[PDB]
Amino acid sequence: IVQLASRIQDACEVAGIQGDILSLVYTDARIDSAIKDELIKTLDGKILSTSELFNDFAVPLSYHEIALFIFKIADFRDHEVIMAKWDELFQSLRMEFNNTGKKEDSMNFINLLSNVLIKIGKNVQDSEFIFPIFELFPIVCNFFYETLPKEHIVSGSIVSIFITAGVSFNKMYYILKELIETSDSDNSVFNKEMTWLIHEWYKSDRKFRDIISYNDIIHLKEYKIDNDPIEKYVKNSGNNLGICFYKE
């Protein structure tokens, strides 16, 4: 169905993905112990093509994260195919969620969902084709909100995923800023996240406190392009915020 390029020189990286498939296969309760033995033999024994891993394993077993990792290793870039795979990921997650309106169930789901995206993002964030933040961020927002009780969704729940996945506060800020000013809709949700982001940046980064005061931060209760403290500072001292700051 989908044809990915393979290179002999990438065998060691392909081996890594086969190890990851192997681990999933090992715990996969849908698979027969005898077949497992065989798949393990295969997966540890030789190097399959990317096309093979995708179409013979990731697709049939519905290992969506693996599919995304194969895309990355194969230098596959097609946006539609990629976001379609992300979509399958989200929907399979929706399938396993138990929506009782219980605060704990909401928390647990939010947790497992976050862990899943954090893990995948740690592996693929260095790629703007496989981890297109500008497009994934709104998708995660919509997803949370289609799924959970509004009253169970804490500000920061979305943006922190990307931060923890390894996106710089800097990059995340500029992307969310462009999301906010580029939408003719409410933005209330984008705004709370941005508010959370900036407060997190402040209390995390002395180099960022060294620029804006405790007072100039406690004011920001809900973000606005004019409320933007980073904006203000730059309208005075330039747009050099220093090198990228990541979460520790």
Swiss-Prot record:
Domain of life according to the entry: Eukaryota
Subcellular location: Nucleus, Nuclear pore complex; Nucleus membrane
Entry similarity comment: Belongs to the non-repetitive/WGA-negative nucleoporin family.
Miscellaneous comment in the UniProt entry for this protein: Present with 1560 molecules/cell in log phase SD medium.
Function: Functions as a component of the nuclear pore complex (NPC). NPC components, collectively referred to as nucleoporins (NUPs), can play the role of both NPC structural components and of docking or interaction partners for transiently associated nuclear transport factors. NUP170 probably plays an important role in NPC assembly and organization. In addition it is required for chromosome transmission fidelity.
Quaternary assembly: Component of the nuclear pore complex (NPC). NPC constitutes the exclusive means of nucleocytoplasmic transport. NPCs allow the passive diffusion of ions and small molecules and the active, nuclear transport receptor-mediated bidirectional transport of macromolecules such as proteins, RNAs, ribonucleoparticles (RNPs), and ribosomal subunits across the nuclear envelope. Due to its 8-fold rotational symmetry, all subunits are present with 8 copies or multiples thereof.
Name of the protein in its database record: Nucleoporin NUP170
Originating organism: Saccharomyces cerevisiae (strain ATCC 204508 / S288c)
Gene transcribed to yield this protein: NUP170
Span within the parent record: 1255 to 1502 of 1502
